[PDB]
């Protein structure tokens, strides 16, 4: 599985144009938040090739 997220996810929407979760986890604002950086796991296509895990809470839980 998935690490669990250990804070709440209540106040974080995620939408076609909405990713609320990035504005910590994303690469530019990991060091800042001190959220840790989505992996290029997130990024890379089929092939590996480098986000498409995009819908966040369809796979970690609170
Ligand atoms: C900044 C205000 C944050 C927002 C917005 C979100 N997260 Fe977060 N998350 C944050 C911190 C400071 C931390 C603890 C440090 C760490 O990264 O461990 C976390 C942690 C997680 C984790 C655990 C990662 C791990 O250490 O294994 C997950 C999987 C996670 N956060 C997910 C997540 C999702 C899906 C969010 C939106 C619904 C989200 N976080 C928002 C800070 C912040
Ligand atoms: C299922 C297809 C996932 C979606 C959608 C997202 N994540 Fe994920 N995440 C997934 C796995 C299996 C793992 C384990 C290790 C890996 O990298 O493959 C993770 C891990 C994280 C972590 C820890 C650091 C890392 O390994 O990348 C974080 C902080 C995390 N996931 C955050 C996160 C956010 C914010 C997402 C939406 C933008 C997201 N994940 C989607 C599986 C899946």
């Known amino acids: ?34 959220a840790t950086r989505i992996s290029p796991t997130h990024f890379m296509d089929r092939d590996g090739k480098v986000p498409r895990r995009y819908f966040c809470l369809q796979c970690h839980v609170s």
């Open 1 to 34: 599985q998935p690490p669990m997220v250990p804070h709440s996810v209540a106040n974080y929407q995620v939408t076609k144009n909405v990713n609320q979760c990035l504005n910590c986890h994303s690469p530019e604002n990991s060091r800042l938040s001190g």
